[PDB]
Amino acid sequence: EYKPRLLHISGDKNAKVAEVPLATSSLNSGDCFLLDAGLTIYQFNGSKSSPQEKNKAAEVARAIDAERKGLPKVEVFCETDSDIPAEFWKLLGG
């Protein structure tokens, strides 16, 4: 059971990213987010944010891209409206 993991990419103007506990409700729409689930991963990026988390997140997905070589499945998208596909929200929130 893979341990889902909640990586967060954001910080208004002080962009800061870091590991985080599960958080569907405490998520932060607008900034870029990354949940890791065994082999699959959803960089739930938030379109309400910008190049801060976006860059930081692209950097995080990057390091993970070089670590796993894309072996695992990833889904990145800095989306906002309807930014809640039951799949990811369910995986970590449902």
Swiss-Prot record:
Signal peptide: none annotated. Gelsolin-like repeats lie at residues 15-55. A 1,2-diacyl-sn-glycero-3-phospho-(1D-myo-inositol-4,5-bisphosphate) binds at R5, L6, L7, H8, I9, S10, G11, D12, K13. Severin changes its conformation upon binding of Ca(2+) and then interacts with F-actin. Belongs to the villin/gelsolin family. Severin blocks the ends of F-actin and causes the fragmentation and depolymerization of actin filaments in a Ca(2+) dependent manner. This is Severin. It comes from Dictyostelium discoideum (Social amoeba).
